[PDB]
Write an enzyme that holds these catalytic residues in place. Structure first.
Site, PDB file in Angstrom:
ATOM      1  N   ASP A 160       0.827  -1.197   0.000  1.00 49.29           N
ATOM      2  CA  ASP A 160       0.000   0.000   0.000  1.00 49.29           C
ATOM      3  C   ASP A 160       0.867   1.255   0.000  1.00 49.29           C
ATOM      4  O   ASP A 160       1.393   1.655   1.038  1.00 49.29           O
ATOM      5  CB  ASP A 160      -0.934  -0.005   1.210  1.00 49.29           C
ATOM      6  CG  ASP A 160      -1.983   1.085   1.142  1.00 49.29           C
ATOM      7  OD1 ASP A 160      -1.652   2.252   1.430  1.00 49.29           O
ATOM      8  OD2 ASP A 160      -3.145   0.771   0.811  1.00 49.29           O
ATOM      9  N   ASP A 217      -0.104   4.853  -8.024  1.00 49.53           N
ATOM     10  CA  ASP A 217      -0.627   3.938  -7.018  1.00 49.53           C
ATOM     11  C   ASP A 217      -0.852   2.545  -7.585  1.00 49.53           C
ATOM     12  O   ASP A 217      -1.739   2.332  -8.405  1.00 49.53           O
ATOM     13  CB  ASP A 217      -1.936   4.475  -6.436  1.00 49.53           C
ATOM     14  CG  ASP A 217      -2.522   3.562  -5.377  1.00 49.53           C
ATOM     15  OD1 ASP A 217      -1.757   2.792  -4.761  1.00 49.53           O
ATOM     16  OD2 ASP A 217      -3.751   3.610  -5.163  1.00 49.53           O
TER      17      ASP A 217
END
Length: 376
Positions: A81, A261
């Site tokens: 993450d 991301d």
């Protein structure tokens, strides 16, 4: 020389196919295509406020299931993450229904556990995550270090995707957030303890295996990319966020924020931009199903273009189109969704990173973009 680990990936395309075949929607969509492009509509359906796409539905989940915390413990499956700074581990003291599913960390069984006890409580709209800091020997690949992670006693906060998915905890790959703690990210901490060369990590996403990705910590393996490696300095101190001139064909956005991301299965576009983008493009949103569809043969499908002072980056249709040819002749969904931020931003997710080898440099506060090597 540098530690490279392999991980599995679950994306929206995977989750969607599950939903389609679970409920035998092999021909709801097929017919919904042949209709909403008939021209009868006079305007293709791109979605409503009632029927929209939620980012959570396009959450890209990267599984690394061979990390360790403590001596005598069950194995833990973590997910990468880049938006989190910390390591989160479900405690054995966690009594929630989601924790009963997962592998739990019992500090009392670890010979190398040092109590911290600094409380961490967050209030998410999705719920509440609660816990405290704990120190123990954390192992990733051939790298070990004494690290302060978070023992979670309440997982209600992100439980929706938690019990649904199969991972146990989270491995932060983002920037330190002092609202939670003063602990450094595990990649930074490795540099602090001189276990890696530089405080950076790279993502190599094999363009032909969307279920696989590779994380390299400490250095840049030249083999992963070809052509010039371009660095774009961060415009934020909490996110891997950069500024690019972003345009798709004739429609254009200037100096937009762009977040890289791996945890997003798509390229997210500002909603207003996405609308003018897809007008009469033979692209429709299947009603009450979270994805856009077009026949992959589509001639007028656009190419993303991102421009900076030092480099320009393009994302051709090849990268955000995933064949759903199994569900019908011609079709392919689009790994593109509409998402509105307070400031106009794009999320450069998995598709962008399937084409571009990405470098995340803590030390230099920038993102390094290079054309990934397709050949091995």
């Amino acid at each position: 020389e540098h530690l490279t680990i392999g991980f599995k990936v679950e994306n929206a395309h995977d989750r969607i196919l599950k939903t389609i075949k679970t409920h035998k929607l092999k021909n709801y969509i097929k017919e919904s295509v042949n209709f909403l492009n008939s021209g009868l509509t006079k305007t293709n359906y791109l979605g409503s406020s009632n029927d929209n796409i939620e980012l959570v539905d396009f959450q890209n989940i990267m599984f690394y299931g061979d990390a360790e915390v403590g001596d005598n413990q069950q194995p833990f499956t973590f997910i990468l993450d880049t938006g989190s700074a910390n390591l989160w581990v479900p405690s054995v003291k966690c009594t929630t229904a989601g924790c009963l599913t997962k592998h739990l960390y019992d500090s009392s069984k670890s010979r190398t556990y040092e109590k911290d006890g600094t409380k961490v409580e967050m209030n998410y709209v999705s719920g509440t995550v609660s816990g405290f800091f704990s120190k123990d020997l954390v192992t990733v690949g051939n790298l070990s270090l004494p690290y302060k992670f978070i023992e979670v006693i309440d997982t209600n906060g992100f439980e929706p995707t938690y019990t649904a998915s199969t991972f146990d905890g989270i491995l932060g790959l983002g920037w330190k957030d002092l609202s939670i703690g003063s602990v450094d990210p595990i990649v930074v901490e490795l540099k602090n303890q001189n276990k890696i060369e530089n405080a950076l990590f790279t993502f190599y996403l094999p363009v032909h295996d969307k279920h696989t990705g590779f994380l390299t910590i400490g250095g840049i393996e030249e083999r992963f990319y070809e052509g010039p490696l371009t660095y774009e300095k961060l415009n934020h101190d909490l996110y891997w966020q950069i500024t690019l001139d972003a345009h798709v064909g004739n429609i254009m956005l200037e100096k937009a924020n762009c977040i890289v991301d791996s945890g997003t299965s798509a390229i997210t576009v500002p909603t207003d931009f996405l609308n003018k983008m897809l007008q009469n493009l033979d692209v429709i949103k299947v009603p009450f199903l979270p994805f856009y569809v077009t026949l992959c043969n589509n001639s007028k499908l656009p190419t993303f273009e991102f421009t900076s002072e030092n480099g320009k980056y393009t994302l051709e249709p090849e990268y955000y189109l995933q064949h759903i040819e199994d569900v019908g002749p011609g079709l392919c969904m689009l790994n593109i969704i509409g998402l509105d931020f307070p400031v106009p931003t794009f999320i450069l997710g998995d598709p962008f990173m399937r084409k571009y080898f990405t470098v995340f440099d803590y030390d230099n506060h920038s993102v390094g973009i290079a054309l990934a090597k397709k050949n091995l």
